[PDB]
Amino acid sequence: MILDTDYITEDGKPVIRIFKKENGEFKIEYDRTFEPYFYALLKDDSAIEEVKKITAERHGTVVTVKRVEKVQKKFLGRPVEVWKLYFTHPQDQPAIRDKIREHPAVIDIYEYDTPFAKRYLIDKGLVPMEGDEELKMLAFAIATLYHEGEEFAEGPILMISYADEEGARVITWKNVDLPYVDVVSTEREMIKRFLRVVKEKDPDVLITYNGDNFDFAYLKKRCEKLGINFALGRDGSEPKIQRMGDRFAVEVKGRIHFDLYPVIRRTINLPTYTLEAVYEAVFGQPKEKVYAEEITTAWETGENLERVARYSMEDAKVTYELGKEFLPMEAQLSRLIGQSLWDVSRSSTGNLVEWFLLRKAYERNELAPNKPDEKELARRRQKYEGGYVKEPERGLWENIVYLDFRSLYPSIIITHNVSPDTLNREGCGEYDVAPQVGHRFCKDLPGFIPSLLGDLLEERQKIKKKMKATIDPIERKLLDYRQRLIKILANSVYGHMGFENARWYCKECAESVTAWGREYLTMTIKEIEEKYGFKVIYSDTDGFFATIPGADAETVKKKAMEFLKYINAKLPGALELEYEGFYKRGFFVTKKKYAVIDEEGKITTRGLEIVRRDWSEIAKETQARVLEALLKDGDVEKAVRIVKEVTEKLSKYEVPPEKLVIHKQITRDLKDYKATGPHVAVAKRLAARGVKIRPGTVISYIVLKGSGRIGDRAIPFDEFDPTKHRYDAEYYIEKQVLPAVERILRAFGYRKEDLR
DNA sequence: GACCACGGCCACA
DNA sequence: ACTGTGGCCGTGGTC
Ligand SMILES: Nc1nc2c(ncn2[C@H]2C[C@H](O)[C@@H](COP(=O)(O)NP(=O)(O)OP(=O)(O)O)O2)c(=O)[nH]1
Ligand SMILES: [Mg+2]
Ligand SMILES: [Mg+2]
Ligand SMILES: [Mg+2]
Ligand SMILES: [Mg+2]
Ligand SMILES: [Mg+2]
Ligand SMILES: [Mn+2]
């Protein structure tokens, strides 16, 4: 099983390393035969003698094109003759690529920025994370002496914790008497001891929570300020720091550092992403939080240091428990994209698609197009029409079916061969014309994009089937992961075609796909209402909610299944409508915002405040109860009563201040803000105290009783002391709770005055 | 000062 | 930095 690839330089020559794990043994395979290269498309196929001769300087050394070779590749759907330029070392390419492009005889260069170790995986056709090898994992967390003001790592690492299949342990230098704590003399002997552990257990995966930006760098600064060699690598190296955008990421050679923090946020939608919040939201059981003010006082006084030890052990224990959960899915993404788990676990959706496309492009001998430069990125800033959304027949509906298309956009690309390489091709024999936008797509040869999506959706439907044969719950989950992933990947391949900075950008392709989707959806809605007597209650991009006005449950289901047979026989090719559920009742407030309950009482809510992370809990909790009494028993009087009980709890300050916290994330640097809302205003006064306010941090503020702007009486929640503060009951009554339930109960005649 | 468009955030598909 | 569609609120201009 391949884990990762990199390269070293032996006497100026690149040497690929492949970090494998086979038969429970860690092996390092070397390849000294791979040559770096990129492509060049010249004006004449004869000037290459001059192109052989361009040189450049790197590090007191002239860089030269080693060898050249005539290649025929597929570019723009037609075979073009391209020139392959071989080099000695990968770092030669950036030092010479511009000197080549600037040559008049060459029009442009291609595939000049693909990293060596990743090109190896693509060209050599290798796929990491495949096989049945069980990787040895080990989590770790630390505890630190913090004071306000002192620079990063000014103080010491008080304790280090770790956890695996043998349990969790703690290592510190102050004497803490507990069965899972190991005491040593000093910090050195602690960090040195922790190194002895990792080297001894030899884990393939090092699991952390935010180790990319804290744990490893703290262990770095002390190790130098103290004089230890952090030989965590299996080659005897130290943790290697990279630059993942504004923030950083940490690699551990020979192993996979799995920072759960990027994985969690990108996967789960939580108002806060603390360890205690993430743990309790994934496993249901809560987790205690000891703060930095406590562990510093507990250290300098020596009092209640055992409480710090429990938290330290808990941190390591829970991150391991979380790592065992989220890693196997991240492994499937690695196999699907064809890049290391370390890379795909922190990659944006766009970059994951490009890597998938680049591998696909290499398999089909498709010369990859460059990324756009400034002028092209300026052009590609347009917009195009997307999915159709109807205005919901606002109110309460009964006996509803939801009919939806199977992968509507990827099925359109497949059915109509939508691809940049099939758009407006001359000499076409069979073409398909896009509605509204009139773009013609050649069907003589299968397009690049349709051929990949076809293989993906074919593999998706293969997985949704074999899953049923398999019995082991793990294989069910593992396989199910690939099923959902293929879908996100497929839709992102569509989104790639409209992406400003995408290599296979094609606005015509992108807007043709949506144009067909509008036609197929509105056609289906036309048929079901005219040829079958339905009334479409609400419809988003790929499906709709409909019912027979009046009628009975089965009558709605029977005619719905009849309509499906009629419409799926009239639907061209890979296009298909499916029965995706019956629902006893359903409330449709507005576009993107509705709630629905099935036959068994499962309430599904979409878009409403109850699901939005930037609303107070007291607002969600009561809208949930109002929706419940509305869809569970239709008890409108109990629903209107509930609003009256909670509104009196607020005015009498009986509701816990924790339920009135609004969580909103800042998205940019505070100088770049043009509108200071309450959450930004709070984050600006925090920057006046010198706190880390970076893009991505969540502001959690409560509004205090007072007058003026909201941003003048909003304080962070960790700053709220109930004895000294009183929250603004009037604000949360008139601006949070009542507005959220009135938009629902307005359909029943009730107004806010009737709810206070 | 009452009225209103609009950053800005997060959600749906 | 995958796409477009969309609801919603505090906040400042505006006559
Ligand atoms: N670029 C981009 N387009 C998207 C995304 N999500 C949806 N689209 C568009 C493109 C998608 O083709 C369309 C609908 O996507 P589904 O409803 O998630 N497909 P399913 O197989 O689940 O249908 P059914 O419900 O019957 O199982 O929304 C996205 O995240 N990114
Ligand atoms: Mg890597
Ligand atoms: Mg290229
Ligand atoms: Mg769909
Ligand atoms: Mg689906
Ligand atoms: Mg759908
Ligand atoms: Mn865009």
Numbering used by the authors: 1 to 756
Provide the publication's sentences verbatim:
Recently, a DNA pol from Thermococcus gorgonarius (Tgo), termed RT-H4 (hereafter referred to as Tgo-H4), has been developed with enhanced HNA RT activity. As previous attempts to crystallize Tgo-H4 have been unsuccessful, we transferred its 18 mutations into the backbone of KOD DNA pol, which shares 93% sequence identity with the Tgo DNA pol (see Supplementary Figure S1 for sequence alignment) and had been successfully crystallized by us before. Just as Tgo-H4, Kod-H4 exhibits HNA reverse transcription activity, as was tested in 32P-based primer extension assays. All structures of KOD-H4 show the typical features of an archaeal DNA pol resembling a right hand with five distinct subdomains: N-terminal, 3′–5′-exonuclease (131–326), palm, finger (450–499) and thumb (588–774).
To gain insights into substrate binding and catalysis, we analyzed the two ternary complexes DNATP-KOD-H4 and HNA3+3TP-KOD-H4, both complexed with NHdGTP. As in the wt, the bound TP is located in the TP binding site in both ternary KOD-H4 structures. Although located in the same pocket, the TPs in both ternary KOD-H4 structures are shifted toward the O-helix. While in the wt the nucleobases of the base pair are co-planar within the incorporation site, a tilt is visible in both ternary KOD-H4 structures. For both HNA3+3TP-KOD-H4 and DNATP-KOD-H4, we observed open ternary complexes in which the distance from the primer end to the α-phosphate of the incoming TPs (4.8 and 5.0 Å, respectively) is significantly higher than the distance in the DNATP-KOD-wt (3.7 Å). This suggests that prior to catalysis, another conformational change may be required to bring the substrates closer together. Further, in KOD-wt, the backbone of A500 can interact with the phosphate backbone via a water molecule. In KOD-H4, A500 is mutated to a glutamate, which—at least in the structure of DNATP-KOD-H4—seems to establish a similar interaction via its side chain either directly or through a bound manganese ion.
